[PDB]
Swiss-Prot record, chain A:
Protein family per UniProt: Belongs to the cystatin family.
MF terms (GO), sorted A to Z: cysteine-type endopeptidase inhibitor activity; protease binding
Cysteine pairs bridged by disulfides in the record: none
Record key words, sorted: Acetylation, Cell adhesion, Cytoplasm, Ichthyosis, Protease inhibitor, Thiol protease inhibitor
GO biological process: cell-cell adhesion; keratinocyte differentiation; negative regulation of proteolysis; peptide cross-linking
Organism: Homo sapiens (Human)
PROSITE patterns xrefs: CYSTATIN
One Gene Ontology cellular component annotation held by this UniProt entry: nucleoplasm
Gene this protein is translated from: CSTA
Subcellular localization(s) per the UniProt record: Cytoplasm
Modified-residue entries (N-acetylmethionine), positions: M1
Marked site: Reactive site: G4
Annotated protein name in UniProt: Cystatin-A
UniProtKB/Swiss-Prot annotation, chain B:
Gene source species: Homo sapiens (Human)
List of glycosylated residues: N113
Gene name of the record: CTSB
Catalytic residues, chain numbering: C29, H199, N219
N6-acetyllysine modified-residue sites: K141
Cysteines joined through disulfide linkages: C14-C43, C26-C71, C62-C128, C63-C67, C100-C132, C108-C119
Protein name as annotated: Cathepsin B
Organism lineage: Eukaryota, Metazoa, Chordata, Craniata, Vertebrata
């Protein structure tokens, strides 16, 4: 019940998938790269004044990539925004607070 | 002992008790819960003579590694112990001016800049700096406000009412579940949801709506969410762990 930490890991779903695609354009311009599809597999959530998502996406070869996305609170609206990526990461890393 | 208790009504001369802070993009709820109760308790304990908004930046950046992992979690019972050991400076001081060490991590509610991206900026625990950010007098190690003792409260409904009524708001923690971000009115009660994670908050009283006995709580996410900042959660059963994590302490000098 770590009062500010990230939840244990959860197998990805299509919601976590709608995010990676909604913030696709946003990751695109920062690395300047072009991906056919970011494919989420793992994720953690965390309670801030909103929820941060720590998603594990697959890029090209056999190496994965990490993504911190802030997700607004019902009140404000349904937003989303890359706040921090973590390109060039390993196949098997724990998702870790960054 | 009373049926209904609200600290904002019992000690109205203390701004901080009616104030809601915006925690931003990082998991410092543990730091806010502690410094806001501590802020509250300093006022109550001096009869309003001293009104300060104790430094959340200080708790976060100067307890640092010893109280958790900054913006990635942390511990209530540790934030409070550190107030006792090394104390905390300000980030809001009453008669207007401005605090010693205010909260630099930008907020998540408001909009600002030009088109909504509120947070998504620094979100990176800054360093400990035993300096007041300039313009505030006096000096850091003199703005320091200390605690006498700190202790856990018991998983008991009455001890909690008795800690609040006798000494002021306290800190606690519970488990958030997606149905909770949806909160607006009434007494919250967990029914479904994905386990989002563990959050920390400020309990400041009690009462009943229809039949449900609740705890008055200040969330740290700004004033649009919920009830102008606050909510009510089921009180009686330790519902989501809200009784299991209660911690307080008593201010030093007064």
């Amino acid at each position: 019940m770590i009062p500010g930490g990230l939840s244990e890991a959860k197998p990805a779903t299509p919601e976590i998938q709608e995010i990676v695609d909604k913030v696709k354009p946003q990751l695109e311009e920062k690395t300047n790269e072009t991906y056919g599809k970011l494919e989420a597999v793992q994720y953690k959530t965390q309670v801030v004044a909103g929820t941060n998502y720590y998603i594990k996406v697959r890029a090209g070869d056999n190496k994965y990539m990490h993504l911190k996305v802030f997700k607004s609170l019902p009140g404000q609206n349904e937003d989303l925004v890359l706040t921090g990526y973590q390109v060039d990461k390993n196949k098997d890393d724990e998702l870790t607070g960054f | 002992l009373p049926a209904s208790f609200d600290a904002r009504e019992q000690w109205p001369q203390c701004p901080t008790i009616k104030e809601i802070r915006d925690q931003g993009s990082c998991g410092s709820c543990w730091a806010f819960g502690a410094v806001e109760a501590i802020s509250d308790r300093i006022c109550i304990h001096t009869n309003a003579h001293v009104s300060v908004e104790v430094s959340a930046e200080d708790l976060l950046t100067c307890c640092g590694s010893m109280c958790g992992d900054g913006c990635n979690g942390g511990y209530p019972a540790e934030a409070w112990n550190f107030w006792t050991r090394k104390g905390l400076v300000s980030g809001g001081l009453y008669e207007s001016h401005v605090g010693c060490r205010p909260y630099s991590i930008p907020p998540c509610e408001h909009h600002v800049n030009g088109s909504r991206p509120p947070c998504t900026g620094e979100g990176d625990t800054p360093k400990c700096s035993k300096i007041c950010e300039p313009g505030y007098s006096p000096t850091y190690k003199q703005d320091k406000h200390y605690g006498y003792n700190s202790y856990s409260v018991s998983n008991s409904e009455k001890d909690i009412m008795a800690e609040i009524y006798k000494n002021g708001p306290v800190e606690g923690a519970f488990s958030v579940y997606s149905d909770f971000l949806l909160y607006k009115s009434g007494v919250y009660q967990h029914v479904t949801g994905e386990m989002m994670g563990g959050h920390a908050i400020r309990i400041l009283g009690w009462g009943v709506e229809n039949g449900t006995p609740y705890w008055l709580v200040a969330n740290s996410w700004n004033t649009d969410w919920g009830d102008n900042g606050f909510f009510k959660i089921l009180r009686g059963q330790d519902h989501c762990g809200i009784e299991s994590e209660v911690v307080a302490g008593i201010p030093r000098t007064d």
